[PDB]
Swiss-Prot record:
It comes from Homo sapiens (Human). Ricin can induce a cleavage by the caspase CASP3. The released C-terminal peptide induces apoptosis. (Microbial infection) In case of infection by L.pneumophila, ubiquitinated by the SCF(LegU1) complex. The ubiquitin-like domain mediates interaction with the E3 ubiquitin-protein ligase RNF126 which is responsible for the BAG6-dependent ubiquitination of client proteins. SGTA also binds this domain and competes with RNF126 to antagonize client protein ubiquitination and degradation. The ubiquitin-like domain also mediates the interaction with USP13. It is found in: Cytoplasm, Cytosol; Nucleus; Secreted, Extracellular exosome. Residues 8-80 form the Ubiquitin-like domain. Expressed by immature dendritic cells (at protein level). Component of the BAG6/BAT3 complex, also named BAT3 complex, at least composed of BAG6, UBL4A and GET4/TRC35. Interacts with GET4; the interaction is direct and localizes BAG6 in the cytosol. Interacts with UBL4A; the interaction is direct and required for UBL4A protein stability. Interacts with AIFM1. Interacts with HSPA2. Interacts with CTCFL. Interacts with p300/EP300. Interacts (via ubiquitin-like domain) with RNF126; required for BAG6-dependent ubiquitination of proteins mislocalized to the cytosol. ATP-independent molecular chaperone preventing the aggregation of misfolded and hydrophobic patches-containing proteins. Functions as part of a cytosolic protein quality control complex, the BAG6/BAT3 complex, which maintains these client proteins in a soluble state and participates in their proper delivery to the endoplasmic reticulum or alternatively can promote their sorting to the proteasome where they undergo degradation. The BAG6/BAT3 complex is involved in the post-translational delivery of tail-anchored/type II transmembrane proteins to the endoplasmic reticulum membrane. Involved in DNA damage-induced apoptosis: following DNA damage, accumulates in the nucleus and forms a complex with p300/EP300, enhancing p300/EP300-mediated p53/TP53 acetylation leading to increase p53/TP53 transcriptional activity. When nuclear, may also act as a component of some chromatin regulator complex that regulates histone 3 'Lys-4' dimethylation (H3K4me2). This is Large proline-rich protein BAG6.
Amino acid sequence: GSSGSSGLEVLVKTLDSQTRTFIVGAQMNVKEFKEHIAASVSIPSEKQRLIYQGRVLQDDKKLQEYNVGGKVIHLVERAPSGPSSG
């Protein structure tokens, strides 16, 4: 889905060199975004924690606000992630 080139791009680099571009509404908030990618990343927001410039992106805050458009954010997963995984 997702038609027309209208939206803000947001990348996410996990702790395994894995950048994933995401197109969400600039209006969207950090939290929401987490819930959105939460699907792809497969990680829950409450577990997620977008970090940029060594700072923890606020939930109430929005991506645009930070200006992470086409930028690479650093998402972290709570608890010690498993090596094998699956």
